[PDB]
Design a protein around this nucleic acid. Structure first.
Lengths: 383, 65, 141
RNA sequence: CCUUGUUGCUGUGAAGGCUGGCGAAAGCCAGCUGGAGGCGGCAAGCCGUAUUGAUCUGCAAAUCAUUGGCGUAAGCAGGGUA
RNA sequence: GAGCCUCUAGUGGAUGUUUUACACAUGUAAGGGAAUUCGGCAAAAUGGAUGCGUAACUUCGGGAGAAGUAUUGGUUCAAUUG
RNA sequence: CCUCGUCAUUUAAAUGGUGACGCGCAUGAAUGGAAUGACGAGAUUCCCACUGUCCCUACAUGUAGACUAGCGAACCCAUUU
RNA sequence: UAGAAAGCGACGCGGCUUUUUGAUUCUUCGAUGUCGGCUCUUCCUAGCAUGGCCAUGCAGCCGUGGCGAAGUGUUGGAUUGUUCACCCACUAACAGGGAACGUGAGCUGGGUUUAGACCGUCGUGAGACAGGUUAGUUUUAUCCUACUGUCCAAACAGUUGAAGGGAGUGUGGAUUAGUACGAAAGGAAACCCACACGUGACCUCUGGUGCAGCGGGUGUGCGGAAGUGCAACUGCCAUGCUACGUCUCCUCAAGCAUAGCUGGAAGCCUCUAAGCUAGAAAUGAGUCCUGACUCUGGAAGACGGCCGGGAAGACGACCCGUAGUUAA
């Protein structure tokens, strides 16, 4: 018989099976379309999640048809996330070829001198090594093997990508001695131009200001917070049963009909929740800056850094460059994230508007924070 | 930037925190937190709550008008 | 859209505040028309989902019945606008407000007010979408 | 049927009695004294209404928890006898 | 000889691990207040003593703790059970 | 029985409750008829107070449960599923 | 209102369906748990709303009859055990059905249908009554298979993408405009902005919670004070977790119904017989989740345990550190 009343499904089947992610560091798996009409540029980067705060911005957005004469301006309060982005270092390149089975890698070429931080990823246990890792490779520079290698890459390739690592030693709160390694794609120009651009930059440091600027739209890829094994009430959102029932209320009561004589994959069951890969599209950059240069607005004539009183709770003080973005972002503090240029441009009016800040909150995140600087606390109390 | 000054405690309130309570007498009043709103309801006199800026001024621990 | 008895001809934009008032709620009448207490029986604009009771915030139009008031007026169905609420609300500028007691005010099908004077304070945002209320309120916040 | 054991704390305040007032009489009204009842709230006990609670390879071939009904009496009980 | 706390006299083992979900015994909750369900089932609310004040009906005994309201700690005094 | 009888009151809305009416399938006088008081862990309807029963669920405690040492069963079974 | 056929369609005639109730007794009486509700998933179309179109007794507004289409929706209550019925309120709309009359080792136990008892009618009686009434025990998974997650098959670092899943839906306001259209009365048609329901995340703010931490009182213990046990009560509140909080959600290609272009058959005509153009919330891809077989690289040592932590966790597994901005 048909059910008595209509209702929507619980949870989305776009994310089933909901299994645990394999490792905590994401690869950018998809990149925006190349265009030979533009200069050679990079398309992505790595970042670390610091924490959250709030800001006040001015706005003037209204319906184009609204008949009001006056150029109304209005304050809006918004929550923001802070990400730390030290410069990445380039250490090699890869070329790929198109086939009936997709892209396949032809060869990889590495710089003559490599850092202790990057060699540390290649071994499993840090403190137990003979360190004979890349010691024979430098001969390939003398032999001309490198010059033969570049020829083959230049002759037979469709897509070119660089290899870059992050300077973990600059962020002590991570307790980490192995760098993270990411493969990043180059768009613009021809294969030859791409290869020459790469060759000029092996061993050097690229700042985040190469890749992104204020007001840009970007996509953020990360792994969510973990929550362990959980029941259907939390995993899929199903309703709790009648209060006087035996054998438990926090369950789906009926898990199928008599035929077919099996359980369907569409029914909710208990299991893992959290620690999955998720991508957030079209987030907007409100600000870019540095952890130890003070700043001011047109209206707030105090001069202060981004760091709140006492630092972010399990991190401390930002020291390197940073990005600020609208809304919340995947995962807890200290997790690695991958940043990408937006896959396609947005038509929505909320996305394409300007941003003008007047205040940024710098009060303590432990307890009720009631001062913006140590000077105010010293003035409120005696002496 | 401040939201204002708390009615009961005397404490200045940061922008984006605290709440206004509006009575049927038609008055609007600003409180720092739920703590001090509740003390008003229970008719605890502020001068007896010794950490308040009000109490400290009344005792003459802090220079005031 | 205008259907059934007591239809409404004067639709306005909702604000997205929290919804403290729902079917079953008894609340005071703030105007001088002669009703005293209203019992909430429906809300305009609600399409509904399974097991959920219809709810309203400031600015919304409710269907109610008169449970206290003058003899001519009792046990009849009427339309009213919600002017204040005991549940907390958040403005887009980040300010939060809370009133001591909730209340509503009676209107005609065309959106005209029934009475001539309104007791006590009224929320600013309501006076932006219902302009006639501005004229006869006690104070605006 | 014969011989025995087992009533603690409290509320209400019948019959009978003493003073004072009112009345021509008959007998009416106050305050106090007295302590009746298969009479009220409880304790020790005796019972078994609800949760259709726990348990249902039990602690148990009828039990356990909270909640209930009566408890100065056609109440409960040991031994001897029919 | 209630519950709670102590003196006399008497008492105890299937080992380690901070230990998800679902349970079984329990706490607390914005705004609303029976909309829940066959059904207020379960829970919450009321609670002792002192005073003020107490309706219909009645076999005149009762109803009756009707209902409805107020007071209550420590200290230092008066006055002698108020 | 027809039947969710008709009219009034209680609700926003009454196959319910109470008040009336009566050719009553098939009421009725110790096969006992009719109207009340006091008393029911008896059946039924409404109001006030009160609340996680519900909107709509969240957090926390004890004991089991997961993993580990010692000890160690039963129902059921043509079986290749 | 003329007029068979906009819409209807008497008197007759041919079919389909299994969602109603019959008819029959093939399977089960060394047992297949029987009505309704609650909870949750999937399917059908005979299309109620939402999208594209054709006819009209289509001026406009509101409608009525038909075509391709099953992606997304279809609610809250009062009386009643009800499925059904009937009213009130909202709505874009409140269509109709199937899955052992879906779903009891998932719950509940109001109805029906054991043993107690009342009433009416029938019987000389014991007793009867698809007549009415009240009280009446809901057991067991530790096996196999399915389903949901977890490890291994697969050294370490960087990747690839076969195949499987799939997601956004609707309402209102403003403007066009008191305009077209109509004697008048009335009265339409993008882009932008606000919201609801659904989906995925997040704690800066505001609610909630009180395990760590600070305070207060009642009864009784340790000769007093100070420090404190037990019975438990009570005010505030870090970190964390959470919603009553905050952020989130479009673009191509091939083409349905239709309306057209060129064009014969058939010197004329004609959307079709070849060929071409515009075309839907529908279909197939991309952006989104899972990740088969592969591919590129470094080096005579590599890797696991043991020891200590967490951002991770049932156990494994994952992320990390071990002579250092290491721990206390």
């Amino acid at each position: 018989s048909c059910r008595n009343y209509s209702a929507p499904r619980h949870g989305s089947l776009a994310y089933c099976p909901k299994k645990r992610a394999k490792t905590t560091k994401p690869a950018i798996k998809s990149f925006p379309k190349d265009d030979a009409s533009k200069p050679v540029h990079l398309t992505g980067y790595l970042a670390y999640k610091v924490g959250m705060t709030h800001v006040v911005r001015l706005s003037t957005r209204r319906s184009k048809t609204e008949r009001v004469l006056k150029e109304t301006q209005k304050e809006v309060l918004d929550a923001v996330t802070i990400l730390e982005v030290p410069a990445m270092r380039i250490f090699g390149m890869v070329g790929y070829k198109s086939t009936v089975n997709g892209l396949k890698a032809i060869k990889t070429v590495y710089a003559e001198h490599l850092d202790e931080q990057v060699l540390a990823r290649l071994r499993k246990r840090n403190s137990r090594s003979s360190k004979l890792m890349f010691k024979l490779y430098p001969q390939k520079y003398e032999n001309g093997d490198i010059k033969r290698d570049y020829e083959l890459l230049k002759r037979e390739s469709d897509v070119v990508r660089v290899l870059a690592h992050t300077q973990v030693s600059k962020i002590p709160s991570l307790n980490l001695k192995k760098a993270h390694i990411l493969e990043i794609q180059l768009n613009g120009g021809t294969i030859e131009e791409k290869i020459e651009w790469a060759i000029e930059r092996l061993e050097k440091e690229i700042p985040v200001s190469e890749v992104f600027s204020q007001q840009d739209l970007i996509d953020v890829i990360g792994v969510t917070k973990g929550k362990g094994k959980e029941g259907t009430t939390k995993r899929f959102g199903t309703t709790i049963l009648q209060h006087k029932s035996r054998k438990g209320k926090r369950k789906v009561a009926c898990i199928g009909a008599w035929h077919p004589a099996n359980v369907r994959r569409t029914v909710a069951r208990a299991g893992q929740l959290g620690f999955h890969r998720r991508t957030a599209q079209n987030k907007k950059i409100y600000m870019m800056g540095n952890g130890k240069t003070p700043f001011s607005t047109e209206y707030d004539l105090t001069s202060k850094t981004i760091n709140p009183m006492g630092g972010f709770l399990r991190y401390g003080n930002v020291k390197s460059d940073f990005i600020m973005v609208k809304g919340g972002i995947q995962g807890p503090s200290k997790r690695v994230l991958a940043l990408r240029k937006a896959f396609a441009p947005s038509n929505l009016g909320k996305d394409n508007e300007e941003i003008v800040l007047k205040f940024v909150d710098a009060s303590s995140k432990k307890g009720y924070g009631r001062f913006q600087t140590t000077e105010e606390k010293k003035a409120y109390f005696g002496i | 930037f401040y939201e204002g000054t708390c009615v009961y405690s005397g404490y200045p309130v940061p922008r984006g925190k605290g709440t206004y309570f509006v009575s049927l007498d038609d008055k609007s009043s600003l409180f720092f937190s739920s703590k001090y709103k509740n003390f008003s309801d229970k008719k605890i006199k502020a001068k007896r709550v010794k950490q308040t800026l009000m109490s400290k001024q009344f005792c003459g621990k802090v220079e005031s008008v | 859209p205008g259907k059934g008895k007591q239809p409404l001809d004067a639709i306005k934009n909702r604000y997205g505040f929290t919804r403290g008032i729902q079917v079953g709620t008894v609340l005071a009448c703030a105007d001088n028309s002669g009703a005293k207490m209203l019992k909430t029986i429906g809300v305009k604009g609600v399409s509904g989902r399974l097991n959920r009771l219809p709810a309203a915030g400031p600015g919304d139009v409710i269907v109610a019945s008169v449970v206290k008031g003058r003899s001519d007026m009792r046990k009849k169905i009427v339309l009213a606008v919600i002017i204040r609420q005991k549940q907390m609300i958040r403005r887009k500028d980040g300010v939060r407000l809370q009133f001591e007691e909730s209340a509503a005010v009676i209107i005609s099908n065309k959106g005209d007010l029934k009475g001539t004077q309104i007791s006590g304070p009224v929320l600013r945002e309501v006076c932006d979408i219902w302009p006639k209320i501005s004229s006869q309120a006690g104070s605006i916040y």
